């Protein structure tokens, strides 16, 4: 009613941020975002809680005035600036480069990538269109439209970006044996790479998804996303390798992590 909601408390953002319960307060509310829902995360949640660089709320805002944060070469001194998916939060001095991927335990990641290969994102398309006065364009995760693309690719694939602007390079379709990747939901983002599609013309879309567990499951289309050619992948996957390894031998693996 009556206007937007410039606050939200904790317990209202989901588990994948891993905040505290007994802070007894308001959550970090994300600002208005380029990309997606509050199932994304703002940058301060990535820094002071996952990467653990600070304690105070005055403290994390004081880092950004020194100008070390960077996505895509863009300045973005907003404190609670939201962070999309696979949108590499590169740094200044301290020189790290973090790609936003999903590990095997629900929430996102703390994963470094190298200096080179960090100058490109990876982009889901959602809407290809000819529009005003014959100017073709695509859209992205953030909806960063790109003038004069590769013509007639389609909606629903992935797009390589050149980071001077869009300047798209390579189309990656969907066929009987490629890479696909879940993004969101109860069984978000391990790998299933494909097994066989379907359509369900008219209502919704489903895709059969075959893990390295070598059984299958099915997640709907808005989590479905393609990475690339099979066994290539463009992003070094984090150190869970995308299985959903089962709980009966999750326990047998973690005391074989400690050696006892």
């Amino acid at each position: 009613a009556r206007g937007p909601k410039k606050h939200l408390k904790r317990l209202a953002a989901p588990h994948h941020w891993l905040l505290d319960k007994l802070s007894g307060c308001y959550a970090p509310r994300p600002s208005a975002g380029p990309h997606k829902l509050r199932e994304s995360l703002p940058l301060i949640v990535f820094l002071r809680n996952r990467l653990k660089y600070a304690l105070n709320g005055r403290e994390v805002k004081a880092i950004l005035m020194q100008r070390h944060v960077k996505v895509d070469g863009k300045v973005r001194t907003d404190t609670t600036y939201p962070a999309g998916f696979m949108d590499v939060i590169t740094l200044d001095a301290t020189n790290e480069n973090f790609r936003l991927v999903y590990d095997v335990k629900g929430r996102f990641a703390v994963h470094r990538i190298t200096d080179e290969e960090a100058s490109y994102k990876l982009g889901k398309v959602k809407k290809v269109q000819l529009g005003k006065k014959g100017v073709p364009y695509v859209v992205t995760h953030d909806g960063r439209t790109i003038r004069y693309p590769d013509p007639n690719i389609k909606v629903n694939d992935t797009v390589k970006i050149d980071l001077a602007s869009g300047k798209i390079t390579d189309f990656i379709k969907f066929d009987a044996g490629k890479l696909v990747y879940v993004t969101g939901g109860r069984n978000l983002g391990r790998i299933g790479t494909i097994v066989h599609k379907e359509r369900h013309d008219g209502g919704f879309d489903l895709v059969h998804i075959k893990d390295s567990l070598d059984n299958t499951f099915v997640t709907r289309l808005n989590n479905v996303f393609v990475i690339g050619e099979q066994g290539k992948p463009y992003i070094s996957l984090p150190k869970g390798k995308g299985i959903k390894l089962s709980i009966a031998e999750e326990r047998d693996r973690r005391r074989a992590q400690q050696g006892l």
Binding site: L22, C25, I247, A248, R251
Partner: protein, 124 residues
């Protein structure tokens, strides 16, 4: 305007109050190792209750069920990390057979007693 922190009660009084030998059976259990009240044998029996309530639900469920193969095997090791019973009764069905005075036996009152040094549970 804040988030709570929970609380819980960790005992339950027995239903029928007055049986002559039953109160004196827990006077044998009072008189064994020097308790101070009647509440702290209610609560391990309460811990006997909802562990045996927890023990009943896997036994009625399926064999070669991984929920039974996880929380039956992790249950019996936590049952023996405190060391109530030894390796001789590690086959997941003696958790039903467990008796009051055995949860009592690994308390720090009667462990200082049994390991010399105190002569008496009241001195312990």
């Amino acid at each position: 305007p804040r988030a709570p922190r929970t609380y819980s009660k960790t005992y339950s009084t027995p239903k029928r109050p007055y049986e002559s030998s039953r109160l004196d059976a827990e006077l044998k259990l009072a008189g064994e190792f020097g308790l101070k009240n009647k509440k702290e044998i209610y609560r391990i029996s309460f811990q006997l209750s909802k562990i045996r309530r927890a023990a009943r639900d896997l036994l009625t469920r399926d064999e070669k069920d991984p929920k039974r193969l996880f929380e039956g095997n992790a249950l019996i090791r936590r049952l023996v990390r405190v060391g109530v019973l030894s390796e001789d009764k590690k086959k997941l069905d003696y958790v039903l057979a467990l008796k009051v005075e055995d949860f009592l036996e690994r308390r720090l009152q009667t462990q200082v007693y049994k390991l010399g040094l105190a002569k008496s549970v009241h001195h312990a």
